[PDB]
Design a protein around this ligand. Structure first.
Ligand SMILES: CC(=O)N[C@H](C=O)[C@@H](O)[C@H](O)[C@H](O)COP(=O)(O)O
Ligand SMILES: CC(=O)N[C@H](C=O)[C@@H](O)[C@H](O)[C@H](O)COP(=O)(O)O
Lengths: 220, 223
């Protein structure tokens, strides 16, 4: 674990999650992007889906934080909400498995998800919304806490939560709308070990609409 | 559709230059076409594509205008952007609406007057990739519809805004292109007078943008 913290120190972790339904949401293109960022020097990835985690882990050698995102009709929890998802991700080749650690309505308790991960041997990453979710994660022996779910229960990333997780002594991953290299740099000096970035890198439709909105507004 | 129609159609628009890095797992015509399809869904009104086969493959899949180019590394010359009229002929037959070319006054296999004239003869609009103001003045003298700041500094890190002002105050149909890496830099391009702005690395070069992020997170992580 201290090996992983030293390996990920000062690193940008690349979230390869194309927008759903896109021409780019294809396992072919996800793997190629995975090979591509590793060739460019990325030290770690966040991959969504058991098949994709399996596919990318057979093509690259850098660590994978695995997830399965499901939008349920009965719950607001999305990030790996079932113990069966934990088991498939581990057999797919993920090193860290992230899950929703909020105290919200859930098909399975957050305590039960966390112990399913530990049962595999994978490290656990807790995607949190508040500081209290990090304390809960720490009480359960969770190796990583992240600011992934802050604001999703907003446009600027939440620096105060990554500072507080760092002021507590947690292994803190800043994640959520760190959209420029300057914003991801201030996360590290905010205390993060690493920072995870997705939309600004692997969601072309999103970054495109960021540009047109600002060029079009000027053109009026 | 005449030139001012394109100018009204492209006013305030971001033109997405889809040119993955050479040798990448991503430098594939499939993945290019996918990106072309996807940015058109997101509302992009124009593209820049490189290579006759890509222009062919993209023009069959989208309906937005394509600015065609051919990039060649010549052993005898520093010019890379469409230096041959045979490249001009394939680009027009590939479906290009606009064809861009190097408009610098450097050593080249075929004269620049001929390339600009070969493009016009096709019916496609012509765009001059310029590095200096006089390269733009030359382009306008030849009946060239579009001048761009594409090559300023490549003959630097901040965009060359003074050239877009000069091209725009001369009355050219000015295309801002080069190092507009953030939506704010592209908004300042339009207010500098550009009709449109072309953005490439920050959108369709994953290896480049990745290295932009690690460069800043790792430099911070030296503490
Ligand atoms: C809220 C939620 O479910 N976020 C997901 C969790 O992994 C991802 O889609 C995000 O992209 C990730 O948090 C990285 O943030 P950003 O994409 O802004 O760089
Ligand atoms: C100088 C040269 O040959 N530029 C090339 C011309 O097409 C491309 O590699 C650039 O990506 C393009 O100009 C877009 O610029 P930027 O990637 O800065 O947004």
């Amino acid at each position: 674990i201290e090996e992983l913290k030293r390996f990920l120190n000062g690193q940008t972790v690349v979230s390869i999650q194309p927008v759903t339904g896109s021409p780019l949401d294809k396992t072919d293109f996800i793997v190629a992007m995975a090979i591509a960022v590793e060739q460019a020097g990325a030290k770690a990835l966040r991959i969504e889906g058991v098949s994709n985690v399996a596919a990318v882990s057979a093509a690259v050698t850098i660590p994978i934080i695995g997830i399965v995102k499901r939008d349920l009709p009965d719950s607001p929890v999305r990030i790996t909400p079932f113990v069966s998802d934990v088991d498939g991700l581990a057999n797919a080749g993920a090193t860290v498995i992230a899950f929703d650690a909020t105290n919200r309505t859930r098909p399975e308790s957050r305590e039960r998800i966390a112990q399913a991960i530990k049962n595999t041997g994978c490290f656990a990453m807790a995607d949190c919304s508040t500081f209290e979710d990090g304390l809960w994660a720490n009480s359960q022996g969770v190796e990583i806490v992240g600011s992934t779910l802050s604001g999703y229960v907003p446009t600027v990333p939440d620096f105060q939560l990554v500072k507080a997780f760092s002021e507590a002594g947690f292994f803190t991953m800043a994640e959520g709308r760190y959209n420029t290299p300057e914003l991801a740099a201030k996360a590290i000096e905010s205390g993060a070990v690493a920072v995870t970035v997705g939309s600004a890198l692997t969601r072309l439709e999103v970054v495109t609409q960021w540009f047109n909105n600002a060029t079009q507004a000027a053109g009026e």
